[PDB]
Every structure is written in C-alpha cells, then in structure tokens.
Design a protein around this nucleic acid. Structure first.
Lengths: 46, 19, 54, 389, 96, 49, 243, 35
RNA sequence: GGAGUAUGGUCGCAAGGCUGAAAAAUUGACGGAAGGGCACCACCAGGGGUGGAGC
RNA sequence: AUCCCUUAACGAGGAACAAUUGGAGGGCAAGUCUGGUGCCAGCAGCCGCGGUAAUUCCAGCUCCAAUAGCGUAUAUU
C-alpha cells in the first residue's frame, strides 16, 4: 500500500512541478524577449 | 490509519477531548 | 560558468576504499571498474550470439 | 491555561483570536444553566477538531464535565504535505457529525479570517452528514452565497485578493429533520497568504446604493419556488430600484448515510445591495423553516424587508461582517484604520469582540462622530510562519 | 531602459526558487520592479549560490546582459550598494 | 552528556545489522524509493466496471 | 574554526541573547532538508534551533563564547531568520550495510545486514544498492540462516562488494534554551572540544573511515572460453584453429 | 588527437550557429524585398 | 519579409433546470422432435494423485 | 617643517617583504537528484562512514589574454 501511494504521489508531484515551471520560464522568456525586440527596433531606428 | 499518519508525520498538538 | 566557481567548487571528491575487515575479498568495485566488467561481458556475449546465429 | 474567559458567547471568536495572538486561553463554564445537555455543543467540538486539524502544535483539552476547555495554540500551517496531508494541493477532509444544527458559515467565517495568516495554503473540504450550506433559523447564520459575495470582498479591500479564493459547493443542503442534519459538501481554498493586511480606510459616505443582485436557491422543492420569490422581492424593491437581478439555483437533493437517505429539503433567498462608491455591500438572507412549509412569496417579502432594514441601518459594513473586518483591522500594521459604523449597527457581539481584544492585548478603539467613525490601532503581528524566500 | 546605463529596482520575488536543477536559468532569474518607471522586469543573478545574497525588498542595481531563457535582458550588478560579485567573493558584508 | 555520548544507530549514517537491536526497524518511520510498478489488486469496483 | 551541529552557540537575535544548540541542514537538491554534520565553509546552510519566535527576514549574529581571552575574532556566524515553525523535518541518512553470502548470476544472498525475518519482511521490496553502482531489490527473506535475504541485482556482484540500503532517519533538534543573562550571571554550556579536553576522552576515529591510498592492479581478464559442443558445431569458415 | 577533435567539433558548432544567423538575416532582408 | 511546426497566455462560444437517485419487427421472442459430429470437463478398460501422520 | 639631493647602520628563501582581472577545459565519492524495455545516460557535486587539533589531500589541476591594471551593462560608432 505504501508503494502504490508513494508512486502515485511522486508521479502527480513531478507532473505538477514540470507544468508550473514550463509556464514560468515561458512567460519570463516571452516578456523579456518582447521588451528586448522592442528596444532593438527603437534603437535601430536611431 | 497508515496514510493519515504518513500525512501527519510531523504534526504537533491536538484537541484533548475529555468528555 | 568556469570562472564563476571557487577552488572549493573545483576540489575533488575522494573515493572510499574497501573496509579493512573485508579487504581479503578484493577491491571494492566502483563505477569505473564496473564499466570495464560490463564492457568485457557485453563484448563476449556479442561474439557468442553471432557464433550461435552462424 | 494562562488567560481566562467565561461563557459560551463568541466562542469561535475567542479561539480564533487566541490562535492568531498566540495567547493560551482557558474558557470555563460553557453551559452551567442547562441541566439536560451541559458541556460543549457538537458544532463547538467539531470546530475544535477543525482548529486542531488546520493548526500545528496546538493542544486542546476538554474537561470531564465538558464545561471547561483550555487551549494552548500553535502555528496555522494549513495543508503542508508532511504533516497535514499527502500532497500540497490535497484537500484536508473534515467531517462534521449528523447532530449539527449550525450552518457551515459558522465554520467558514472564523476559518476565512484565520486563513490569510497561515503558512501554506488552506484547502479545507467540509463533508459529512451535518453540513448545511444554507441559512439556519438557528442563530441566523449566513448562507454560502451570502458569505461569499458579502464578506470575501472585504478581504479584497484588505489586500487579500479574491483572485485566489476558491469557495465552491459540490452539493447544497438545508437542515431537514428539525434543525439537525445537512449533507451538502463544500471546499474552500485560500491560496492568498499575506504578511500584514493593509490598513484600510472606510470613511467616505456610501450614499447611492446603485444595484441589487441576489441568489435564490431551492434544494428538494420545485423550481418555480425561486421564480415566485423573485417576483415577491421585485414587487418590494421595484418601488426603490430599477435593477434588482436575482439568480435562480436548483439542486435535486443531497444524500446522507443512515442505505442512504435524501435530506436537506428547503429553499431560501439572499440579497446583496451594492453601493456605487466602493466595496460597500449590504446583505440579507431568509430560509424556509425545515418543517414548516411557508409561502415563498412570504420568504421573498421577508428577505426584501431585511435588506431594506440593513440598508436603512448600516453605516458602511453590516453587523454580520463587522466582527471580521474589525478583527482584520486589528491584525493589520501598527497604524490606525478607520471604519464608519452606523449607530444602530453596534451590537453585543461587536462589543464582546472589543472586550476580547482589550483582554488579549490589542489596543482600544477610538469612537468619534462623522454614524460614528471607529478607529482601530493595529498590533502588527501578521502571520508568524511564512517561508521568506 | 530609460536613458541611463544602470537601473535600480526592488526584488519583488525570486521566481524559480523551487526549481530542481542547480544552475538552471529559471533558478537564476529574479523578478524585480524598476523604481524610475514602475515596471516589473526579470534579471539574472550571475550564479546559483550568489542567489542567496538577493533577499526580498532590497535595492538592486541592474545592467544589460550582453552576450536557457533567451531574451531576459538584465543582470543584477549591485545589491544594497555592495557589488554582487564582491558579496560572492566574500569581500564585503551586505548592509541591511 | 547527550552531545558527548555516542550517536544512536539512526543518527549514524551506515547502520549494518550488528549495531541495532533485533526488530528495531518496525519502530521507525522512514521513507525510501521502491522499484517497478506494483500489480493492481482486483477490487470490487474493478470487477464491476 | 568550523562549527559543528549539536554544539552550543550564543545567538544574538532580536533583543535576546540566548545560547542554544542548533542543527545544520542543507536543502539537498530542494527535496528533503538533509542534516549536515558541520557548517560548510563559505556556504549558507540552514540551521534550526529552539528559541524565541521572531518574524522572519530578521538578521542575526552568532558567537561561541563571550570571553576576552579569545586570541582572534569572537563572532562565529551571521545570517537571517528564514522562517519559524514547530516540529521541523530534518532528516539524516542511515545506511544499512551488508555483505554478500552466496552469489549466483543475479540473485545474491546478503548476510550481515538484518537480524530477523521480521525486519526483512518490513524492508521487503526496498531499493538495495552495491557500492559499485549495481542496483537491486530485496526480494524475499531467507529461512535457515536467520537474518539473511535474497536480493535480485542488476548484474553479477562480487564477494568483495558491499551492499548498502540508504534510508532516511528523522532527526529532531534538542529543546535547550539558555538565556544569556550577563548582568546577573549565567552558566555557559561548553563545546565538545572543551568537554573532551576537560574530562579527558579522545575523539572517536574509525580506521575504516580514514581515507587511504588504494593500490589498484591493472584489470586483466581471461580470454574467451568457447564451449566444446558449440566449437564443434560451428561451420568451416568460422571454425576455431588451435594448435 | 582526441583533444584536437573536441576543439574541431566546437569550431564546427560555432560555424553552424553563424551560418544559421547569416541565413536568417539574408532571408529576412529578402522576404521584405518580395513583399 | 513569406511558408510551415510547436509552446504559453488572453478572449468568445460551449455554460440557463415541466425538475427532485435506484425501442425495432413482413427481418422479432422462446421452445419440442428427428438425425449427425465431438469430448479422459462422457461411457468402457486400466493407471495415478490428493484426502491418513509431520513440515 | 616636509619632499629632493647627500647618508652611517640594518633590510630575501616561498610556510614569504604574500599580483591581480577575466575566459576556456580536464580529473573525484560507500554523497544527492532525474530519465529508462539490467551495468546506461544527464544535470551536477563546499554536503561522504568517522573526525575540527581531525585532516596534509589534483598538494599548490591545465591552457589562453592583459598585467598595476582588468572586467561587466547600456548607448553605440
């Protein structure tokens, strides 16, 4: 019983961690790259 | 019993119900 | 990187030996010696499988 | 054992303030007068069980007579996966027994004002036979809809944002056979834990009550009941307001264990008047008697009359949500926060809360005229345990 | 940003403090809020052990990052008036 | 005296079978990894489904 | 000096000066809060003690002994209060170490690890491991020698190998609290080195634990040994020619 | 020889990166010309 | 700049309760009697277990 | 008064009269984490059984650039 419970909990916890940090890294890269490309466009026009 | 103790591994204090 | 690490970051981790009460059994096989053992056995089994096919 | 209280009035307020301030209490002489059922009530002992479940290191001790408890509080951890549950997203189960007469907002109001001061999230799930999600005749408890859209915006005022509060019902229920019983399960998920609540200021006059929105719910009766209730409430409030809009909700019946039975047959209404100025809302509720069978138009007229009473009476916050906003104002930072109560709003429960705060160690309140402005000095405790990363 | 070379900021929250692998760029990145303009931008602490000196609500100088999340543009240079590489090299203590 | 005294077998990192008492594992609460999937026991809901 | 876990330390934290004995624990790779035995040089480790509660992000200093005859630099540790709790979750590795008894191709019988079939039945299915890196699983308790078991490994282990099982035993900190009432007078709990030098007991040192240089001979293996029936059955172009 | 082959593989990786960057810059310039 | 392929957000629909748990067929439903085929879950001829004591 | 110029006497063996700033790379455990059709791979690793007056270990790892100077960010030219 402890084997089945611990394996279920490990699968759910690893899936939740992977999903959350994929979201976080994607949002950070999206916002930072958007501002970087806007600044490169505003700098190349000068 | 066993899963509840595995959840409350480190849980201190409880309601002491003398009635 | 490689300049963002101290010398204590670079310092090697030593390998433990066989216990002295058990040194008569030979050397304590770690990952390197195990890799050598597994390479030799996989090579010999590959030759034997080809000989059995032939 | 150190601090000493008497009586069964404002019992949950005393235990919750004891948990939040960390002061060990001893409440003596619960029911000295009652010879038939002396000692603790079943809803009180179930609130003790829930408090032990969500806290950690708290020691509760009920005596042999049941008429004296003592309580040394611990930290409000919540649902940590090492002590309370198995996973961090797992709902801590709490069962309350079939001999429970008070509504579930009797458990939710202290838990919701004790929940922003926790370490991890709170994911409590109230199941069991005696979980009534309605208003009670009882001590006139709020409903779940009244509780939600009348008092959780006050946490939104304090800066505990309601973007992360998840109070959801999965079955709904009224009392049923007599006052005892229930069946409808809920789960509340506080994911918004703050260090210190903001010192808010309710001072400007909340004059123009712009609109009325509400919820009329029916569990176990015909679904024309809420339509008749809406026509009654609109017939009362159409003299005053052009936009009253009341949702209709219907659930078939909840089943409890004895072999299951269907219990919790009833219907009720809950009006919320929103003032155009700020987070100022007046709420009123009315539920059918659990054995009576009264007219739904009588219930709609009764809740509309109670709503117009609270609109006439209240300064800024109604007296049902006044203890919650006042104790959060006391938990805030070491500045003054200014609430605008009506002179008719001041109640013995509010006065008893003032006595309990003065006994615990918070500062007194300053009452001046403007309805009266009550000004509260925060004590600057906040939450004790939070992983500052 | 702005017209200056370095900006100041408040460390709102070290995002990716619960990331698993030690030198992940999600582990190294920190969400800060610039003082002059008010926007929340993300910046790299140069090292994972050097992340421990960055505490919440600390005045943080940050510059450009000129060379795993490509596009995070800033790097934290000074924390509370003391250079972050000096804190990492254990030259100075952080005044709090 | 506790700081100067010998460590318990749970606080020593390597506990072979000579250190501890006989059935001393049954009194402990440790976590450890398992290997492989367990077989699902047939329960009445499984047979009904 | 480095500063050991268990040894007492005078914390200046809040208005309180208090001598308590902490537990140093690293957060292993953000998984389990493993208990260290010393503070790491030039690294922030977590500590955990039993003292008064303070709201977190509160910096603190930390001394060893309030003596003027210290020849150098009385202050020992610095830092900041991370969080407060009751009943921490500190965990130390306990390795059950055993020895192979009979070694077949995969299943080896392992002797000097447990004492009874009750303990083996508790630790049934556990992830056992060789020092070399061979994984394995405890399969079944063994009947006739009481305390041995059968464990099916990944490949063949040797009789020289050491078979470990890495369990995690929880460690609770002690609930000691000295106030450093200096204007009245106070008893200062000593360190382990001062205790050993005072009451004359040597430091425990294991010769099997002290690192040595290992003389490895170059591993030469035997040649291939082809069986007689296979060597007589394989065809002419691939027949083995041995004079 | 193995050290030289490692450094040669690193140089070829840099060559493929600069080739991809110059290819995208050229086709970004031409895709505006055919628009 | 064009064309694909992904990834994560945002929005819109889905997302309103004459309601309150446990048919098809000119082709379908069920049989009976007769006659076949097969079977160490049948007959026939034998053999062998288990079941008595202990682990 | 100082500095300068004159100037008797001391004033070098590395564990010092104690060269720095960057970049690239190798080697390591009875340690830890993750993936999976055994022994593999990846991220990495101040954290190892004991031990802090204990240890003498890659004993001071290898290479490149500038060197009393050197790096980073942004604007850029």
């Amino acid at each position: 019983f402890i084997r089945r419970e611990q394996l279920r909990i490990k699968k759910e916890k690893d899936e939740a961690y992977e999903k959350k940090f994929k979201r976080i890294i994607a949002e950070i890269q999206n916002e930072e790259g958007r501002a970087a490309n806007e600044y490169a466009r505003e700098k190349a026009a000068r | 019993t066993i899963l509840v103790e595995m959840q409350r591994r480190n849980k201190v204090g409880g309601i002491i119900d003398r009635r | 990187m490689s300049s963002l690490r101290h010398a204590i970051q670079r310092r090697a981790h030593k390998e433990r030996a066989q216990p002295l009460e058990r040194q008569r059994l030979g050397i304590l096989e770690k990952k390197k010696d195990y890799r050598l053992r597994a390479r030799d056995y996989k090579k010999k089994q590959a030759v034997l499988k080809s000989l059995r096919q032939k | 054992e150190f601090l000493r209280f008497t009586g069964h009035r404002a019992f949950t307020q005393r235990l919750v303030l004891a948990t939040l301030y960390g002061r060990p209490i001893h409440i003596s002489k619960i029911r000295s007068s009652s010879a038939t059922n002396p000692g603790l009530a079943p809803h009180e002992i179930s609130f003790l069980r829930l408090l032990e479940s969500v806290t950690n290191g708290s020691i509760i001790d009920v005596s042999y007579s049941g008429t004296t408890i003592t309580y040394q509080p611990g930290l409000i951890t919540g649902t940590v996966p090492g002590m309370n549950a198995s996973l961090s997203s797992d709902a801590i189960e709490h069962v309350i027994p079939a001999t429970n007469t008070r509504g579930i907002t009797y458990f939710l109001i202290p838990l919701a004002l004790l929940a922003p001061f926790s370490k991890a999230h709170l994911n409590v799930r109230f199941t069991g036979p005696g979980v009534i999600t309605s208003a009670t005749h009882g001590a006139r408890d709020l409903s779940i809809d009244t509780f939600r859209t009348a008092v959780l915006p006050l946490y939104g005022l304090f800066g505990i944002p309601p973007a992360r509060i998840e109070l959801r019902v999965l079955q709904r229920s009224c009392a049923g056979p007599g006052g005892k019983g229930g069946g409808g399960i809920v789960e509340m998920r506080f994911a918004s834990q703050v260090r210190l609540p903001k010192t808010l200021h309710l001072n400007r006059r909340p004059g123009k009550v712009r609109r009325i929105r509400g919820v009329a719910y029916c569990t176990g009766v015909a679904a024309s009941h809420n339509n008749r209730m809406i026509t009654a409430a609109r017939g009362v409030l159409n003299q005053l307001v052009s936009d009253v809009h009341i949702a209709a909700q219907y659930d078939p019946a909840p089943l409890v264990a004895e072999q299951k039975k269907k219990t919790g047959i009833g219907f009720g209404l809950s009006l919320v008047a929103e003032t155009s100025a700020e987070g100022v809302i007046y709420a009123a509720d009315e539920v059918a008697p659990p054995e009576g069978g009264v007219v739904p138009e009588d219930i709609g007229e009764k809740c509309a009359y109670q709503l117009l009473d609270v609109i006439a009476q209240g300064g800024c916050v109604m007296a049902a949500s006044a203890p919650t906003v006042l104790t959060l104002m006391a938990m805030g930072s070491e500045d003054v926060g200014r609430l605008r109560l009506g002179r008719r709003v001041v109640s013995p429960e509010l006065l008893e809360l003032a006595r309990d705060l003065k006994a615990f160690g918070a500062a007194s309140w300053g009452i001046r005229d403007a309805d009266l402005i009550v000004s509260v000095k925060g004590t600057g405790v906040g939450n004790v345990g939070r992983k500052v990363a | 940003f702005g017209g200056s070379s370095h900006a100041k900021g408040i460390v709102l929250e070290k995002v990716g403090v619960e990331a698993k692998q030690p030198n992940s760029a999600i582990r190294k990145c920190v969400r800060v809020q610039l003082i002059k303009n008010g926007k929340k931008v993300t910046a790299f602490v140069p090292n994972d052990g050097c992340l421990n000196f960055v505490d919440e609500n600390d005045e943080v100088l940050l510059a450009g990052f000129g060379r795993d999340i490509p596009g995070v543009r800033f790097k934290v240079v000074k924390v509370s008036g003391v250079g972050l590489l000096a804190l990492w090299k254990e030259k100075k203590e952080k005044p709090r | 005296a506790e700081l100067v005294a010998k460590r318990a077998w749970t606080l020593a990192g390597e506990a072979t079978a000579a250190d501890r008492p006989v059935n001393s594992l049954l009194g402990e609460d440790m976590e450890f990894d398992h290997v492989g999937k367990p077989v699902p026991v047939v329960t009445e809901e499984v047979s009904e489904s | 000096k480095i500063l050991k876990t268990g040894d007492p330390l005078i914390f200046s934290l809040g208005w309180r000066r208090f001598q308590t004995l902490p537990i140093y624990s690293i957060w292993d790779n953000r998984t389990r809060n493993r208990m260290l035995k010393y503070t790491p040089e030039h690294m922030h480790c977590f500590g955990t003690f039993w003292g008064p509660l303070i709201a977190p992000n509160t910096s603190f200093c930390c001394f060893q002994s309030f003596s003027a005859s210290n020849p150098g630099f009385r202050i020992a540790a610095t830092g900041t209060v991370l969080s407060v709790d009751e009943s921490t979750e500190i965990v130390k590795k306990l390795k059950l170490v055993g020895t192979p008894w009979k070694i077949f191709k995969n299943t080896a019988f392992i002797k000097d690890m447990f004492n009874s079939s009750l303990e083996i039945a508790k630790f049934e299915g556990a992830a056992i491991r060789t020092v070399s890196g061979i994984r394995g699983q405890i399969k079944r308790a063994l009947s006739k020698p009481e305390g041995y078991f059968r464990a099916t490994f990944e490949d063949k282990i040797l009789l020289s190998d050491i078979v470990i099982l890495k369990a995690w035993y929880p460690v609770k900190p002690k609930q000691f609290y000295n106030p450093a009432t200096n204007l009245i007078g106070w008893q200062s709990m000593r360190l382990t080195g001062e205790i050993r030098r005072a009451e004359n007991i040597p430091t425990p040192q294991n010769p099997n634990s002290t690192y040595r240089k290992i003389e490895r001979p170059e591993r030469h293996f035997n040649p291939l040994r082809v069986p007689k029936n296979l060597a007589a059955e394989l065809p002419f172009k691939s027949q083995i020619v041995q004079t | 020889r193995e050290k030289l082959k490692k450094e040669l593989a690193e140089i070829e990786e840099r060559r493929r990166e600069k080739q991809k960057k110059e290819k995208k810059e050229f086709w970004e310039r031409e895709g505006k010309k055919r628009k």
